[PDB]
Ligand binder design. Structure first.
Ligand code: APS
Ligand code: APS
Lengths: 313, 300
């Protein structure tokens, strides 16, 4: 009965996520912790050409008024489905090896990932919807495709003052503060959504309360402070006023996929070593899982090294 | 704890696919209005514009990819809400028989693979859709069609959907994809290992040759490294495809006959389909509710 610890580092770009996780990985034994890094190689080359470059210019040309909404939406939608592929595929090959949950002895293997599938099938799409470059229907199609949430899905979101974030961000993608505001808002919403569901929130019961951040602590947030609030869009509403059932079912799925997640908030308003040690203290309350076969440890380990080996920076 | 029989009627369109049995119809209203405006027309116009040289290959692919997301949404949301109610295999007549108009693989693999063959979708986008195919649950019975090509052209010509353009090149492509699909399931069911037979594509139990399966489509140069090796991320996606396809139960329905005949042939095929148990006492009625509400809201 060997155990596994899976930790997905996620949240808005530009906070220091990659650095903190390399630092955490650099403390461990080469063989008891493996990092699944950002698939930069799939991105700029393998899946398509310069994927991040096509996105930031299309929104920039949508702002100006050089290309309509529909035009930007088709480009944003296809960019996202291609961008999320590595996360989805990783999740699908690992799935069969993950047993039930399980404080406990040291995990036999710790897998740290640069992002979870929900960044590409939920968060980024919702942020683009708020920026006007994606339709709500398309965001819900992404949501309906989120894979079943595996036991022990530990997701680490980040915290950081916007002023420090804007400054960290300005390093050299283009300088898009509106998008920065939109993605921070969506991740704030995401943490509250997990809290809401874990405290027994039923969006169907509270839908009517809509008009006009901690993920594992505190009281139940108001539905207005969760991701459900984004789906009040007239496009999704029938002539009767309520959501078409098709979109309501997607919110049911959103609710199911996030209800079982374990979310932690890491403060990035610190030096790199500071972030590392805090992430390392956080991993202590995270949930481990048993693996289905005995050979899953080495198997999974190989899968992760291969991904790192072929798709990093 | 009652039994359920799920039957997905799929295969290329245009062949004739149009109380204890519920029928989940084609979500035409989602395609023409709820998810977007006239998605079929946008698909067919885009391919037409590419064919005439009015737009680029890259341009048509972004348009196609986005429209395929819209086309697929109803199946994917349907599978996600239904999945939790599906239990293990049971094998007597079933408590409920749910007949669906298409399975998620139509939109997350077949149509996409066919547009890749029409030069309007990248192979990488096709594999992004495949990676998102939902886990194959017990009792996934998929009915595929058989019909000679000229009878199919006749039938399709009398059956055009709103915004569709009669395109014989897309007909051949979708037909080829579906024939490869049937071959692929048999290849996997008889022990075929794509990784072991990959070398047979690039330089030459009893089952189809891998060149006669969907794996042959993924020998696309965009997915290979400079030394000819398939990138691991794509090899992964093929591993998922084998896993999803191997456990489906495919039934072939001969459509070269009358609706009466087809109806009965379809009912005849039901004897070898696999039934499951549901997981709750309220699953039947809830499933039932889902089915009728989908039909009312999204059915033409
Ligand atoms: C650097 C990028 O902003 C990070 N990133 C990671 N996944 C993404 C996605 N699916 N869409 C947009 N940006 C994404
Ligand atoms: C309109 C008919 O149902 C054909 N048809 C059915 N599903 C499709 C898809 N997902 N993409 C393109 N055409 C499709």
């Amino acid at each position: 009965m060997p155990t596994l610890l899976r930790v997905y580092i996620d949240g808005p770009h530009g906070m220091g996520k990659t650095t903190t996780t390399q630092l955490l990985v650099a403390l461990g034994s080469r063989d008891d912790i493996v990092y699944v890094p950002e698939p930069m190689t799939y991105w700029r080359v393998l899946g398509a050409s310069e994927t991040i470059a096509n996105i930031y210019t299309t929104q920039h040309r949508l702002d100006q008024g050089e290309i309509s909404a529909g035009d930007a939406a088709v480009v944003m939608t296809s960019a996202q489905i291609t961008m999320g592929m590595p996360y989805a595929v990783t999740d699908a090959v690992l799935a069969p090896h993950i047993g039930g949950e399980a404080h406990a002895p040291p995990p036999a293997l710790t897998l740290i990932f640069d992002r979870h599938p929900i960044a590409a099938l939920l968060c980024y799409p919702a942020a683009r919807y708020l920026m006007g470059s994606m339709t709500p229907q398309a965001v819900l199609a992404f949501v309906a495709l989120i894979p079943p949430t595996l036991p022990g899905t530990n997701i680490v979101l980040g915290a950081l003052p916007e002023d420090r974030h804007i400054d960290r961000l300005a390093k050299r993608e283009r300088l898009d503060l509106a998008m920065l505001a939109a993605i921070r808002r969506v991740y704030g919403l995401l943490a509250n959504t997990v809290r809401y569901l874990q405290c027994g929130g039923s969006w169907r019961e509270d839908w009517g309360q809509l008009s006009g951040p901690q993920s594992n602590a505190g009281p139940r947030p108001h539905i207005g402070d969760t991701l459900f609030t984004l789906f009040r869009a007239p496009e999704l509403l029938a002539p009767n006023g309520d959501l078409y059932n098709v979109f309501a079912w997607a919110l049911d799925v959103l609710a199911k996929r996030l209800r079982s997640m374990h979310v932690f908030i890491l403060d990035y308003d610190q030096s790199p070593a500071g972030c590392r040690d805090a992430l390392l203290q956080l991993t202590s309350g995270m949930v481990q899982t048993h693996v289905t076969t005995p050979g899953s440890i080495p198997t999974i380990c190989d899968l992760a090294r291969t991904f790192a080996r072929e798709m990093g920076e």
